[PDB]
Amino acid sequence: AKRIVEPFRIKMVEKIRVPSREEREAALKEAGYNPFLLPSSAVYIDLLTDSGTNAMSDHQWAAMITGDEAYAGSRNYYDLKDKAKELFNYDYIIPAHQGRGAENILFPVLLKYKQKEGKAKNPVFISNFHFDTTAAHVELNGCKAINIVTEKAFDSETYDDWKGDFDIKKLKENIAQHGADNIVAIVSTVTCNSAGGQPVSMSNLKEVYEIAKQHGIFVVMDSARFCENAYFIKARDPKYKNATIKEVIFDMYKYADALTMSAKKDPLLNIGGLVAIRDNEEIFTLARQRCVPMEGFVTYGGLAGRDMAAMVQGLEEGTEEEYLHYRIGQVKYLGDRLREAGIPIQYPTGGHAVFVDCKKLVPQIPGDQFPAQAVINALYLESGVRAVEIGSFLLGRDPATGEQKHADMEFMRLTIARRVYTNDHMDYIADALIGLKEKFATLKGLEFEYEPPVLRHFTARLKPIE
Amino acid sequence: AKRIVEPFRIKMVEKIRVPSREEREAALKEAGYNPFLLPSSAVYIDLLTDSGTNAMSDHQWAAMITGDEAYAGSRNYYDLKDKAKELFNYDYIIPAHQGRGAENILFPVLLKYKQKEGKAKNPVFISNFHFDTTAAHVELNGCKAINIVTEKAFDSETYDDWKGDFDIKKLKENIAQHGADNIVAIVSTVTCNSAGGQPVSMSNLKEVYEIAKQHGIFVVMDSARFCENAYFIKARDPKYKNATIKEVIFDMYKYADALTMSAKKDPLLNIGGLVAIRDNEEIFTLARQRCVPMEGFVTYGGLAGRDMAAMVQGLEEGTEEEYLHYRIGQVKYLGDRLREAGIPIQYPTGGHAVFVDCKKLVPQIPGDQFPAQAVINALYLESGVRAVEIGSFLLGRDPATGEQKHADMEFMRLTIARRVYTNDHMDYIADALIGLKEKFATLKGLEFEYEPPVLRHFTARLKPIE
Amino acid sequence: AKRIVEPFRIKMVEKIRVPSREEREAALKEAGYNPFLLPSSAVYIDLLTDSGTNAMSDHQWAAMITGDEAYAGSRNYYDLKDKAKELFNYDYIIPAHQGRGAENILFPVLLKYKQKEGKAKNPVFISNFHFDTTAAHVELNGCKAINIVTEKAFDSETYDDWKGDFDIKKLKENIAQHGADNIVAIVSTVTCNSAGGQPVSMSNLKEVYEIAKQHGIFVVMDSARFCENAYFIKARDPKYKNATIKEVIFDMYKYADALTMSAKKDPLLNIGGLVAIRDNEEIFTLARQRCVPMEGFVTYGGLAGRDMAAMVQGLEEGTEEEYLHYRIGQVKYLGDRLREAGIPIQYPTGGHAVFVDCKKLVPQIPGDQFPAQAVINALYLESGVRAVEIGSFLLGRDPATGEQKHADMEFMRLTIARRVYTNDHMDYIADALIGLKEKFATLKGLEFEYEPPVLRHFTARLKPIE
Amino acid sequence: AKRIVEPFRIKMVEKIRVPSREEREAALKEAGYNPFLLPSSAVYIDLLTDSGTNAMSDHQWAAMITGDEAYAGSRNYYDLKDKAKELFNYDYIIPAHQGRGAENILFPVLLKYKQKEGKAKNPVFISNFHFDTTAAHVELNGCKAINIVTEKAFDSETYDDWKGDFDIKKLKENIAQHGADNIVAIVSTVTCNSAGGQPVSMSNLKEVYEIAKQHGIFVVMDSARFCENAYFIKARDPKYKNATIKEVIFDMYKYADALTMSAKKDPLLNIGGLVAIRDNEEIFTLARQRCVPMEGFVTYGGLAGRDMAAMVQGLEEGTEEEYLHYRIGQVKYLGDRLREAGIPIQYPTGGHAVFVDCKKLVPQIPGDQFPAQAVINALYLESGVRAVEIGSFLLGRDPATGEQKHADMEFMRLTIARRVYTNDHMDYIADALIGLKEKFATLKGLEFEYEPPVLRHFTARLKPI
Numbered sequence A, B, C: 001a002k003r004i005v006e007p008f009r010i011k012m013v014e015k016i017r018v019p020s021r022e023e024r025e026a027a028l029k030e031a032g033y034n035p036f037l038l039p040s041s042a043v044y045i046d047l048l049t050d051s052g053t054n055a056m057s058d059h060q061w062a063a064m065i066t067g068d069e070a071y072a073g074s075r076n077y078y079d080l081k082d083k084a085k086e087l088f089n090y091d092y093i094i095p096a097h098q099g100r101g102a103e104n105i106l107f108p109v110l111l112k113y114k115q116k117e118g119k120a121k122n123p124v125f126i127s128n129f130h131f132d133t134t135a136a137h138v139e140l141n142g143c144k145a146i147n148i149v150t151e152k153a154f155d156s157e158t159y160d161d162w163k164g165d166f167d168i169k170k171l172k173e174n175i176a177q178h179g180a181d182n183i184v185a186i187v188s189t190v191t192c193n194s195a196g197g198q199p200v201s202m203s204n205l206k207e208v209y210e211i212a213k214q215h216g217i218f219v220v221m222d223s224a225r226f227c228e229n230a231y232f233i234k235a236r237d238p239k240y241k242n243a244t245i246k247e248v249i250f251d252m253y254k255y256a257d258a259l260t261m262s263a264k265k266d267p268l269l270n271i272g273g274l275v276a277i278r279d280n281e282e283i284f285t286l287a288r289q290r291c292v293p294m295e296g297f298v299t300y301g302g303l304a305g306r307d308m309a310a311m312v313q314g315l316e317e318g319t320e321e322e323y324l325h326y327r328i329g330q331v332k333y334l335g336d337r338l339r340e341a342g343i344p345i346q347y348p349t350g351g352h353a354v355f356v357d358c359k360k361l362v363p364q365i366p367g368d369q370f371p372a373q374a375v376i377n378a379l380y381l382e383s384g385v386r387a388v389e390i391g392s393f394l395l396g397r398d399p400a401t402g403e404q405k406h407a408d409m410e411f412m413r414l415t416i417a418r419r420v421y422t423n424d425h426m427d428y429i430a431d432a433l434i435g436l437k438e439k440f441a442t443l444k445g446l447e448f449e450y451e452p453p454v455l456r457h458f459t460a461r462l463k464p465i466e
Numbered sequence D: 001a002k003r004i005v006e007p008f009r010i011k012m013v014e015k016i017r018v019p020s021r022e023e024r025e026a027a028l029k030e031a032g033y034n035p036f037l038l039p040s041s042a043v044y045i046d047l048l049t050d051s052g053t054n055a056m057s058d059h060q061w062a063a064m065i066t067g068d069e070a071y072a073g074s075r076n077y078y079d080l081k082d083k084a085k086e087l088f089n090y091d092y093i094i095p096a097h098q099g100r101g102a103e104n105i106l107f108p109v110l111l112k113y114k115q116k117e118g119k120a121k122n123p124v125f126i127s128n129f130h131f132d133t134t135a136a137h138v139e140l141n142g143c144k145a146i147n148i149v150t151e152k153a154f155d156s157e158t159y160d161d162w163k164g165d166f167d168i169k170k171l172k173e174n175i176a177q178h179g180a181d182n183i184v185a186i187v188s189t190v191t192c193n194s195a196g197g198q199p200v201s202m203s204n205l206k207e208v209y210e211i212a213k214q215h216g217i218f219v220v221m222d223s224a225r226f227c228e229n230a231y232f233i234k235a236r237d238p239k240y241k242n243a244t245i246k247e248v249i250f251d252m253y254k255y256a257d258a259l260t261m262s263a264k265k266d267p268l269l270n271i272g273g274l275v276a277i278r279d280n281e282e283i284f285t286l287a288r289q290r291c292v293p294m295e296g297f298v299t300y301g302g303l304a305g306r307d308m309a310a311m312v313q314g315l316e317e318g319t320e321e322e323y324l325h326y327r328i329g330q331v332k333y334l335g336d337r338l339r340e341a342g343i344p345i346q347y348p349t350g351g352h353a354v355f356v357d358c359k360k361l362v363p364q365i366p367g368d369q370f371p372a373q374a375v376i377n378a379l380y381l382e383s384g385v386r387a388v389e390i391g392s393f394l395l396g397r398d399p400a401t402g403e404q405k406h407a408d409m410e411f412m413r414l415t416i417a418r419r420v421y422t423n424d425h426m427d428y429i430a431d432a433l434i435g436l437k438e439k440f441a442t443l444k445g446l447e448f449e450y451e452p453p454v455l456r457h458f459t460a461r462l463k464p465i
């Protein structure tokens, strides 16, 4: 395990504290054994998500101070539009308040556009792996979300360079089955969050886009972690060994038609989202027509002007290779600490989190009883670290049948905010989970007390089994 | 006209600039003669809206600096929930990114809830006046938006205390014609933005609420400008002559079942919304379930934690009587400057804006040629001040008819951001408008060029008559 | 009077409060009838000083955020050094924590440098008027502080373009009387604070410098309000009618060898000072050697790095003609209000304050009973406005025999912080003071309870003389 | 060597970068081989000082935003006055722009007050050790600055609990030789910076104070690093084993009559200083009379209001035991990395810095050829880290003679700002210096090329010899 020093020093700190065991126990049962329902005051180190918890730089706070709060035509909107042209070569932007705001703007528009000629009678979206809000927006619009990640992602301890890849064979199988007239869009998620933050190769992106263009299928790049994906391409694709990160990104986005981005991840924000379209002006116009009632006027999209200003600056800092090297290396450092102690993880670690394989850690719990959630709850009670489940709990049920969706992966996700915790916090996380080696065998699954019908895991309340 | 001293001093400034006449003429042509498409760099004083353009206090910025950016369970969420319980006596909150996000959370939930009871077969919403985004959500969900503002609102020059009131007789008539089963909700807009930011009396709110409870009709207070409404109730209802603003607010919210609020208005924010529900926990659960995919997790609703921090402080400052006296008095000052010179305005002035009655100012232009917009563009080229139309352009077209909705009013809205401009800025605005006295008789309408089917006035491009 | 509109808008506000008459009564009594000892919570509008109370721009706060806090070699030190070179064409800078820090750095260095030839045996400084701290550092170093402003400044009500000018005849007469070898330095105070903020013409500065170079005398420019002086030169000198402010400043500093500066005035700051030296490297070295033990290392001089950063931006904004026109026009507006009601003031008003001639306002109180303080207290008890005395109380005792220094002017200074108050605040001050006209004749003087030996007007406690 | 985790997380970052070797060479040549003259742009990790470079907390920045900028009577002045009453039990405060401003306010007052009785005809100040500016202000007012730190501070590698203590025998011996009438003040420096940030025990402070009240001698507590001293008292004195930091602080200040403080240290600021006085109103009145011409009005003292508000918050945060345990533990960690690799240091490490004994690292470099500055220069060229010298380059020239290289200690001070650098930055520093064991044999001394007659270290020039 190699500690990689920070390419920055600390400018402002925020106090954290360890609540007592009795605090955690009470807090956990008040939360219905769902850490999502814990107040942050009951949490020590928060690894629930890497979304919106990032530490910004002094340059980003300075851009916020001068942000233009105008309702129409803010200076920062044109800065953002120029930045998107520079980074992605895309000519149209619509800001959004966050990632799922951007999907709410763009996915219904693509559905209605697909349906112009009486097509898309049984519409589907295809992705390497739709994430929760992305899949929810697909199914909310009467569509069907189809995930075709390479099965190399299901073998956690076996190394592979691109565990986020599409399965090209499955892609052509699904185009054959559903027909090109039913494929509303192909969504390229970079990195692929559900597979463990794993990168997608340039040739995979290129091949998917080529196949999509042969059949006239629109391609949207889900871009929340595009910079981490770009680093992995440079690190592992020998054709880009000597390319800058911005060069890698520029090429990535030749293989999509639009992007939806949660700017709360790689652009180092606490809020903010973005739709960008390469050249299709009709889609842009219709998406502006939906942005207005749903998010806000087209030049702020539900963002304060200061947040668009932070986004312009963050979109630069997120691409800096020295920062990416440290950030991705801190995640690798945590994973190696765990792997060197026998804890099974998705190998190699992704860009933003360590995914602990709980199928192997607590095999006496079936997936329908949420084995990873039992490990998470145990970790919290022994240390105050809050982590999140990426398995059967999160996958939800099938909108057609109503039964549990088959989860090929039961992960506890140790999600790392950008520039927030040190390697010594990592050591704390590792040692607390490593110290649980004995308790794992005697952990009990969990049963629903209250299940919402869409995105259940966010607000569900659970009870142990026996 | 009377000038009221600020109950505060200036702590931070932002430069503004007057663009040369040539720049304003180029900019407007580029903007398709729709000032919504003008960049703020081409606007001197911006009166397009009082939403999100407010100046915050130093306590609000200090609150943002210590805002808890936790994804789930931010301590600012809990402070917000205590503040709603203090101000409104409501027990449930869901933050939203702004007002139209709050509406998207609550309104489809109220429709769907009524439909599951076998009701809302031909669903309508009834309001004193739905504002544009509010009515757009009503229509998007398949319902009709009915406005029943008191007829005194159309009598522009004639003073009345409560021009935002419901017409009780039309309330009963519509309940009779559509049936209580089809009324999805009554929306009490306070102040009534579309009537000229004019107040709704306490006795009107109370009688409306009593009528609704008789029929089992849910009542929603659209609370964007609730503090401005509360001040007017104190200024004009002798029953509250010696009450605090908070006591007036506490009584107002006895007469709704929930509220949707744009926190970008009276809470003095640049971004932010809120849903609060008095005590119906079922609606709260359903709205929480719709929040998660649309806005964000239920303890931040698409806001950064700093923005929830600003909101808690802003709701306290928004209610301070000496501030409101200054704020509403600045609006009155602007209105009095114009009324002195013979410009017909909605009288008395509302809380947030002067409404210049363009039916009486420029009678030669037909209602279907948007007379108020002709005045707006003329004001912009003359002074670099940007205003907004509240007439036929805004009303758009009638659903199911594709026809211009009947516009009882043609208004140019001089919208005043909170704590941003001085009374000397007000004199500039007034002087520029007065100077066009002789050119009012020689103005013409405009023709559509690109008309959006919903909320057309935002991105529509226009062209002069000749 | 004429109100000039702000060339900016408000971005952040700070609440102020009017304390009751009963509070003012108790507060002034506890403060030893000396408003310097009032807590700010007892003041509504604070006209005590324009020093360090200014409102900064968003750009200045953005600069503070990215300030370099390094102990040696802060990035902002080199920006400040380039700024001084651009504005003044001076090659050396030493930052200081404020104006009197700069004086404590430079004046002792100028004295010992003058002594190095066996000279300065009876040392004096000559100025148009030494400000209080300036004169105190002169006297504390064993030297005499000579003031020789134009007698036009004693003709309060009579207009003159240049009431801050040196009396040239007195300059030459003091040189002949004292000998050039005794004049440690000539201090050109621009604007002349003690005369009423009144400007020094460019030809007056040029002639003073030429006389000083004729005699080998070092010339320091006390530059706290150099930007207000530069404006007045462009307004009133036909040679500079079409120059830029920066061009005027560039020429002003041709007529000095160094400057001391409180950046708490015209650079729009809350803290900060500066020494800059044109090209005498020996003085620079000796001043650097004094800086280290008194102020701090020579690249921050007792300033945080953010404050140096704010100083670089402020030095630019303070020279903007549009801001200067408004700022100086705001002071003129308050003066004309008082001048129109028959209140005698120093006319024309200067850059930063209105000086009310209390010698004429309350002719019944002798100067040793400090008549201006009588007015000040009355204005405070009536309105919560706090002003300051610029008369015999401020002038103090002579260093020999403790005799009261004969004051030629007994002023009440209404000092206006930059970009902080509106013209409606100005209206409040004027109406308060205008409303006291029936009570001026029935006012008494004051006598000492505790007199500090140096700068008594700051901590002295007074008792009314009845 | 034990890494202690942060009791906080990062809210805001500032970017740094390692200048290429050529830039470091160019920078050092242009800086005249004096790192005090390097632009920070040429510096990676700055160890020049722990003064004014600290990272503030979000509560401190929020305090700054609501700061009351009023010239007289700022709300934050009254908050600061109530804070000093709470922490120290002292009744009077005067804010100051930084520590040496506080010294300029109070020390000349103390001499004048002692003179007005007919005493202090041959005036001296006595300290466990006067810091540099402190001693400079003493000597600028015609007095002699006497240092009488325990002799255990001179045995660099031998552990002692309290290497900052007063030598009590020398204290009594100096009171006997100079006379109580000539001792203007006793200055207790906590922690004792010039000894290596080494703590003073409570019983030592108490005994110094007792001897001084017998002889009528005023006692000033130089409090730049009083929190670190309180932590060490709690760590090493069993009587305070179960006391809180604030109780230890409350007890320390029973043994002084006044304090001067650089708030740029333990109160976690970038600027700021403070004078506080226990109960002597006359000394307070005289100090105010000096504050007004030197610093500013008595309710802001040359500080912006935002900085007084920060100081009120930082005074609270600087006493937090979990923070102090982390902060002092990180310095200990750096020292242990070096000590475990054979690098001689002042042991145990102080509260704010590791001090490296360079005479043992560069033997064939004598004192007048700047042995500690040679290591520092080599270290910067090799790593871009800037450290400071506490040896014969700082010591300067004998009066009317030559190099006062009577360097009792030839130290390189690796000074650690609070809450700024991680333990992985600590590793970089240690690995860089440890990596210099090979090139130590180059033994390249340093020779002047330009020199000032006074304050040479702050701005001199030299060349390798």
Ligand SMILES: CCSCC/C(=N\C=C1\C(COP(=O)(O)O)=CNC(C)=C1O)C(=O)O
Residues within 6 Å of the ligand: A296, B048, B049, B050, B051, B098, B099, B100, B101, B131, B132, B133, B134, B189, B193, B222, B224, B225, B262, B263, B264, B272, B273, B388, B415
């Ligand atoms: C053509 C004017 S532009 C639109 C912004 C604005 N009004 C917003 C309101 C909203 C929506 O809230 P938001 O999503 O936060 O904008 C709900 N209810 C009411 C009464 C409002 O006034 C205004 O300027 O009048």
Ligand SMILES: CCSCC/C(=N\C=C1\C(COP(=O)(O)O)=CNC(C)=C1O)C(=O)O
Residues within 6 Å of the ligand: C048, C049, C050, C051, C098, C099, C100, C101, C131, C133, C134, C189, C193, C222, C224, C261, C262, C263, C264, C272, C273, C388, D071
């Ligand atoms: C009633 C409060 S007097 C203190 C502020 C004050 N002027 C200060 C001046 C200084 C010293 O500068 P600082 O140490 O930064 O205060 C030097 N020269 C000149 C012309 C000045 O005016 C004022 O209010 O006029």
Ligand SMILES: CCSCC[C@H](/N=C/c1c(COP(=O)(O)O)cnc(C)c1O)C(=O)O
Residues within 6 Å of the ligand: A048, A049, A050, A051, A098, A099, A100, A101, A131, A133, A134, A189, A193, A222, A224, A261, A262, A263, A264, A272, A273, A388, A415, B071
């Ligand atoms: C606490 C766990 S759920 C918080 C969501 C967060 N991911 C968000 C996300 C979005 C929506 O972006 P946004 O609407 O801004 O959240 C879209 N696409 C992808 C690939 C994403 O990963 C995450 O993985 O932790």
Ligand SMILES: CCSCC[C@H](/N=C/c1c(COP(=O)(O)O)cnc(C)c1O)C(=O)O
Residues within 6 Å of the ligand: C296, D048, D049, D050, D051, D098, D099, D100, D101, D131, D133, D134, D189, D193, D222, D224, D261, D262, D263, D264, D272, D273, D388
């Ligand atoms: C390279 C050394 S530069 C000096 C700055 C710093 N120490 C300052 C200090 C002061 C002056 O305080 P201030 O005037 O605020 O600096 C007073 N007393 C003590 C015990 C101090 O340690 C330090 O040790 O680096």
Ligand SMILES: [K+]
Residues within 6 Å of the ligand: A051, A052, A053, A270, A271, B069, B070, B071, B303, B304, B305
């Ligand atoms: K957040």
Ligand SMILES: [K+]
Residues within 6 Å of the ligand: A069, A070, A071, A303, A304, A305, B051, B052, B053, B270, B271
């Ligand atoms: K905004």
Ligand SMILES: [K+]
Residues within 6 Å of the ligand: C051, C052, C053, C270, C271, D069, D070, D071, D303, D304, D305
């Ligand atoms: K100030």
Ligand SMILES: [K+]
Residues within 6 Å of the ligand: C069, C070, C071, C303, C304, C305, D051, D052, D053, D270, D271
């Ligand atoms: K600093």
